[PDB]
Write a protein that binds this DNA or RNA. Structure first.
Lengths: 112, 112, 133, 786, 29, 123, 56
RNA sequence: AUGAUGUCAUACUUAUCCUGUCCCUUUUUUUUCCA
């Protein structure tokens, strides 16, 4: 509806109508705007095809059911790392189990 | 034709994403894919010549993928023909989807 | 069976073709009616001068079009049609307004054509897609 | 003076041309012998009635086409407003409904055609730019879940008129020109120099006596713009009285008082009217333009002003070239108009610059991020650099994300797609900044309002032709003083702006030339030499130049025109010379078209000729669709040479019915294709003049290659085991990578261009036989050299 | 061929014969 | 069917029959003729490319060479009267029409090579 | 087109080889081809028609 | 008994090399019986 009315108003859909809804929907909204919309508009029957790839390659695809270019990216596990650290004890409780202090490195923000 | 070819060749590359220890024969396939990615019209000329004139093909290999509760046959075709088949595949699915061959109940579909 | 089916397809085709043909001939004859009554409703105070202006403009139009066709075989096609398409031309002629488009901060924040699912390989570290810090 | 003997020879040419055409007419009426029972007539009378019927049907719906057009054409400008009566109103509903009725009565037939071929037909064994709306319902299909005021116009026009920098200067300068025949009118942009001056002169009565007022411009479309606005003021139809004539586009009628044209158009009016008798005023705009035609017309009209005192010569320009202007024109007075809208703050870099591209980048970075509202214009040299620039800017865009706001990077040059040229003309979207990376084409004739900043790299791509060896090199060159001056002046047109130069005040005031080399010096002059030999100047040495060319360049020019035969062994015109001279293209192409008559490859050489006319911009080569473009180009590649490749592409385009989306699909610029088409038909409009008969090579590309041989025999190179080397000069050339034979590498090659880019180059080349060179030019090409 | 009278893959083709001077590697093999 | 399955020649001829019928009904559509396609008297020549200096008098003279003329009508711009640079000429014989045509085609009068055609005029 | 149909069906008839056993496919379908999706779904379409009936 | 002629690959020499084809700024030019 915002698209149609932005034709009626003939204004330009700006980033503000589309950052509340940036990772929502099933394709995904951030698919409308990826780089290769132009050569992926010609890939049809890709779902059947990834299904039949099991008779061609000797390995098992655990995401046989989806495609990241076409379906968006349907999960985000970036809070998991943060809350895992807060549950193990924090970087301090985590590094008192390690050889961290025997390195005498002044602090752990530089580790690499 | 070049969009359908780019899609075919990207799909064929997707096997050796790892860039593993592969072998001679996958080495040879990667060679064919790269030289067709560089010079896309000798490729397509070959492809249509094949589709027009060829009717006796080389021999296929079979082996089984052991899934511990049943086995899956895995077929091993040669590179030149894998490229011709990948392009034929893309072309058929594209056209079939444009002329509406498959009614809406044939359902590993691209929509969900 | 293929020969029999080919024949039956062809003849069913031309059957319905002709039926729709007669349907269009009916449509156009009622358009005949429409046109006659159009001119009939036509036939029966700026009207006088704008009318002399009708004959004015149309008559020197036929004069200019005649003599265009005459001097050059078709300079009516050298003059009238080619006049009305080129870009800076139209910008000069003040012609107004000769699809959805939007912000471009959106685009190309993402690049690629392949699914990041490695094509079935799993042993590479693709869990999170933004560095920790 | 020389003007009058020129005149003499010209009128002699006109009567000789008339008599020549008359002789041709009688000759051909001689050559075509007009040699022009009961049941015989009773048999053929039915058949002539058959063709009568049929051609009458074509002609009948043709007159229905005539009045079909005419109904809606006349009702456009009469009905929608005026208080008109029963009769013509009735006729409006009649023509409206009745044309709709005809439209639907043919739409019925069309509908049945398409729905009756729609069906299933068992197979038979027998031995517009919206792919981001074909990918926007794929998502919305995947994501669905259902189960008077015209007086006010004129008062406003005159009110703004009153605020021109020439409007108070009206009467003083009108009396000024009433005094002296020759008047220098020095004035900057926006002054009204081009618009109001001819209006005034219309107001003065210089139009009576049946006189006209000429205003010439260096550019067609600029002439159109000026004409449009002056007609807007004039409140009349542009084209009847205030009119313009440029190539392929006449918008003048016999009411024409104010005729706008280009300098070449006025030159070619000197092909029709030597003393300019119907024009009382010739107003030549921005003559600083340094055009071949500008410095030809200068001399010719100087002689006219000497020989025609009541004639009016007004030549206005922007810059300080008035010294030499008056000096050549015997010290005309200089009327100063002050015009400069808004103040311009020009900044200098603190030191000189090392990598001015990155300096450009980071300059616009900071200007955008820190400046308040206002557009940005930035100069670069050209296309390769310009897309690299936009690459860098859009890279920064991606990396810094929403910590910035919308940076519409807009590149612009001449050969990029025209829709994307139009792209920059949209009014800026609120909140967003509009940054235009440009070539010096946006120095002149592109007025994009809103520009408040402009940055100058102090450089430019200047051509430099040293005839020394025939080298035409588009080289990097620090920009002129006047160049940077107006590159500053390009800004400020709506508000106080800034112009940051990438170089210091030191380098500016110290290391700067005033005006770019008057082109007569730098350019290759074949067409204008042939042209003044067309008017009959035998002694071209003591000719009235403003800037004479070096004797060397005209030497090699004359030797060239002699070699191709246009001059006899003393250097005057052959019949070939003059007939090739009328063709407004260089003699290379004209002599090849001369050969097409001998070899019977008329249409093909016509089309190749039309192709090299605009060639440099045929094929688009985007970075985001590189491979699709390379392939749609490799599609046409035929053996023999890229000239016949161009032949084939035009063949295929006209095959399509001259379709735009054809060229869109096949990665070809529609602009070049369309202009090449109209220039081909213009050559056919001159085709009977030069005595050319229309025959095709019948698929014999040997004839077409041999006609190209006869035309461009000078333009040939041969193999050497140290590279490709010239035939005559034996200086080293190289193969253009964009050439259809770039890796086939023929032993004997013909070319068309001669540049020395990063390597010495030649463009649009073809494989030749060296035997055809002796077949064509045994007096210039002898066997010992091949 | 029958259908036309009435109207790569190099395994199938015969073998290019031996040259006069066999290329060195042809000999060492 | 069989109004198509006979040839390609008379198929396109029947295509001409139709396009004829439709262009007729199409002119009657836009409301010009009272009667539907009266086949025209073959006894008039529509002779175009005419000169604004040649009037009914000189037409009558030059077209009197081949037959008895019935009249000479150059259709007039009504309130200006100047020749439209075409004309109709009316004979007594079909034989006159053909005898004038087959010699007067593409011929020069008053320095203009005029055209002769039969009258398709339904007026 | 009969050309592509002949290619597709002449391609399923190949020699299948494991370590030292070889035979010829003559009856079924090799699913390790790349157009086998199209063949399977079209044939299944014919069987959807047999199961539902043309009317339904 | 050793000729030149060679489109012969191999062998060999100089503490002989690791030293490589990429892509054009701006822009103007008179026209002729229609049928």
């Amino acid at each position: 509806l915002k698209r149609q009315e932005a034709i009626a108003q003939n204004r330009r859909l700006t980033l503000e109508d589309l950052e509340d809804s940036w990772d929502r929907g099933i394709p995904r909204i951030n698919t409308l705007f990826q780089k290769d919309r132009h050569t992926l508009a010609y890939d049809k029957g890709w779902r059947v095809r990834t299904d039949f790839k099991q008779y061609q390659v000797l390995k098992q695809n655990p995401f046989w059911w989806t495609h990241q270019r076409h379906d968006g990216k349907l999960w985000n596990l970036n809070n998991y790392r943060t809350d895992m650290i807060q549950a193990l004890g924090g970087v301090e409780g985590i590094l008192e189990h390690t050889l961290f202090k025997g390195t005498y490195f002044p602090t752990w923000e530089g580790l690499f | 034709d070049t969009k359908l070819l780019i899609l075919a060749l990207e799909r064929l590359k997707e096997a050796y994403s790892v860039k593993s220890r592969l072998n001679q024969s996958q080495r040879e396939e990667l060679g064919l894919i790269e030289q067709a990615y560089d010079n896309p019209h000798e490729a397509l000329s070959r492809i249509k010549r094949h589709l027009l004139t060829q009717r006796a093909f080389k021999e296929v290999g079979i082996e089984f993928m052991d899934l511990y509760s049943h086995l899956v046959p895995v077929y091993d075709v040669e590179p030149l023909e894998k490229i011709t088949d990948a392009y034929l595949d893309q072309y058929l699915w594209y056209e079939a989807d444009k002329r509406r061959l498959f009614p809406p109940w044939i359902k590993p579909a691209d929509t969900e | 069976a293929d020969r029999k089916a080919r024949e039956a397809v062809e003849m069913r085709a031309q059957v319905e073709r002709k039926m729709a043909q007669k349907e269009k001939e009916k449509h156009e004859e009622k358009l005949r009616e429409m046109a006659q009554k159009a001119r009939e409703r036509r036939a029966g105070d700026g009207e006088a001068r704008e009318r002399d202006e009708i004959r004015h403009d149309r008559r020197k139009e036929r004069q200019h079009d005649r003599n265009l066709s005459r001097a050059a075989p078709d300079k009516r096609s050298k003059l009238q049609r080619n006049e009305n398409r080129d870009i800076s031309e139209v910008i000069a002629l003040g012609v107004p307004n000769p699809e959805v488009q939007y912000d471009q901060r959106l685009f190309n924040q993402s690049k690629g054509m392949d699914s990041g699912f490695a094509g079935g390989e799993d042993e590479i570290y693709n869990v999170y897609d933004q560095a920790w810090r | 003076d020389e003007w009058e003997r020129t005149e003499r020879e010209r009128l002699q040419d006109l009567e000789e041309r008339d008599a020549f055409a008359e002789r041709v007419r009688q000759r051909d009426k001689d050559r075509t012998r007009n040699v022009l029972a009961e049941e015989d007539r009773k048999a053929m009378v039915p058949e002539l009635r058959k063709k009568s019927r049929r051609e009458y049907l074509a002609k009948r719906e043709r007159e229905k086409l005539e009045d079909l057009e005419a109904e809606l054409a006349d009702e456009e400008f009469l009905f929608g407003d005026v208080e008109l009566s029963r009769h013509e109103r009735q006729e409006l509903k009649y023509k409206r409904r009745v044309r709709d009725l005809a439209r639907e009565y043919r739409a019925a037939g069309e509908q049945e055609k398409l729905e009756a071929t729609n069906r299933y037909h068992m197979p038979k064994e027998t031995r517009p730019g919206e792919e981001q709306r074909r990918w926007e319902e794929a998502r919305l299909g995947a994501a669905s879940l259902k189960f008077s005021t015209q007086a006010q116009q004129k008062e406003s026009i005159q009110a703004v008129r009153r605020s021109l920098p020439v409007f108070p200067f009206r009467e003083e300068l009108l009396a000024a020109i009433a005094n002296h025949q020759v008047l220098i009118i020095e004035g900057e942009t926006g002054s009204g120099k081009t618009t109001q001056i001819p209006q005034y002169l219309f107001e003065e009565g210089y139009t009576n006596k049946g006189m006209k007022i000429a205003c010439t411009q260096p550019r067609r479309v600029a002439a159109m713009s000026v004409a449009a606005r002056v007609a807007r003021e004039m409140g009349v139809k542009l084209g009847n009285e205030v009119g313009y004539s440029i190539r392929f586009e006449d918008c003048t009628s016999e009411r024409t008082v104010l005729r706008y044209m280009t300098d070449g158009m006025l030159l070619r009016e000197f092909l029709s009217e030597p003393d300019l008798a119907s024009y009382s005023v010739v107003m030549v705009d921005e003559a600083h333009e340094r055009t071949l035609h500008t410095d030809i017309l200068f001399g010719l009209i100087k002689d006219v002003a000497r020989f025609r005192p009541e004639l009016k010569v007004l030549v206005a320009s922007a810059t300080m070239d008035t010294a030499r202007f008056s000096t050549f024109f015997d010290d005309a007075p200089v009327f100063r108009i002050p015009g400069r809208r808004f103040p311009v703050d020009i900044f200098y870099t603190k030191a000189p610059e090392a990598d001015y591209l990155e300096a450009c980048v980071v300059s616009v970075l900071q200007i955008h991020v820190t400046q308040p509202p206002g557009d940005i214009l930035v100069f670069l040299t050209g296309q390769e650099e310009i897309e690299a620039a936009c690459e860098m800017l859009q890279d920064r865009c991606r990396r810094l994300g929403s910590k910035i706001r919308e940076l519409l990077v807009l590149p612009i040059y001449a050969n990029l797609p025209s829709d994307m040229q139009a792209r920059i003309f949209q009014p800026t979207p609120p909140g967003a900044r509009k940054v235009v990376v440009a070539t010096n084409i946006a120095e002149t004739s592109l007025t994009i309002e809103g520009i408040i900043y402009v940055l100058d790299p102090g450089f430019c791509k200047q051509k430099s032709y040293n005839p020394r060896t025939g080298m035409e090199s588009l080289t990097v060159t620090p920009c002129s003083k006047a160049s940077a001056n107006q590159r500053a002046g390009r800004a400020g047109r709506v508000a106080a702006g800034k112009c940051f130069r990438l170089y210091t005040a030191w380098a500016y005031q110290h290391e700067l030339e005033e005006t770019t080399v008057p082109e007569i010096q730098r350019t290759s002059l074949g067409n204008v030499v042939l042209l003044l030999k067309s008017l009959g100047i035998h002694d071209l040495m003591h000719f009235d130049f403003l800037d004479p060319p070096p004797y060397e360049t005209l030497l090699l020019a004359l030797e060239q025109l002699y070699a191709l035969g246009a001059l006899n062994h003393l250097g005057e015109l052959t019949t070939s010379g003059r007939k090739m001279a009328e063709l407004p293209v260089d003699p290379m192409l004209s002599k090849m078209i001369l050969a097409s008559e001998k070899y019977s490859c008329s249409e093909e050489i016509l089309t190749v000729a039309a192709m090299l006319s605009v060639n440099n911009s045929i094929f688009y080569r985007p970075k985001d669709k590189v491979v699709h473009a390379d392939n749609a180009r490799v599609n046409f590649f035929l053996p023999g040479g890229d000239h016949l490749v161009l032949l084939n592409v035009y063949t295929q385009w006209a095959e399509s019915g001259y379709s735009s989306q054809w060229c869109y699909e096949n990665f070809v610029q529609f602009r070049s294709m369309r202009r090449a088409r109209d220039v081909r038909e213009q050559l056919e409009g001159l085709l009977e003049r030069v005595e050319v008969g229309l025959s095709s090579c019948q698929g014999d590309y040997i004839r077409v290659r041999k006609a190209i041989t006869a035309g461009y025999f000078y333009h040939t190179a041969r193999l050497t085991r140290s590279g490709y080397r010239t035939v005559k000069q034996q200086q080293t050339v190289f193969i253009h990578p964009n050439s259809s034979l770039f890796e086939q590498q023929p032993r004997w090659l013909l070319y068309h261009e001669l540049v020395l880019t990063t390597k010495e180059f030649m463009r649009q080349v073809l494989e030749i036989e060296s035997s055809w060179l002796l077949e064509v030019a045994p007096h210039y090409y002898k066997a010992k050299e091949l | 061929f029958l259908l036309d009278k009435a109207a790569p893959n190099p395994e199938t083709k015969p073998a290019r014969p031996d040259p006069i001077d066999m290329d060195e590697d042809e000999l060492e093999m | 069917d069989d109004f198509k399955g006979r040839s390609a020649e008379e198929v396109e001829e029947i295509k001409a029959e139709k396009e004829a019928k439709t262009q007729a009904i199409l002119l009657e559509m836009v409301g010009d003729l009272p009667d539907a396609d009266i086949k025209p008297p073959e006894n008039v020549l529509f002779v175009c490319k005419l000169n604004p200096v040649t009037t009914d008098e000189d037409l009558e003279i030059i077209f009197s060479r081949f037959g008895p003329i019935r009249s000479c009508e150059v259709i007039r711009d009504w309130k200006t009267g100047e020749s439209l640079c075409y004309a109709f000429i009316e004979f007594e014989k079909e034989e006159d029409c053909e005898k004038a045509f087959f010699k007067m085609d593409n011929v020069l009068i008053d320095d203009r090579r005029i055209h002769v055609d039969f009258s398709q005029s339904v007026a | 087109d009969h050309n592509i149909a002949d290619y597709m069906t002449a391609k399923n008839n190949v020699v299948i080889n494991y370590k030292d056993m070889n035979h010829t496919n003559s009856y079924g379908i090799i699913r390790g081809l790349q157009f086998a999706s199209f063949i399977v779904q079209y044939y299944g379409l014919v069987m959807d028609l047999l199961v539902l009936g043309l009317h339904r």
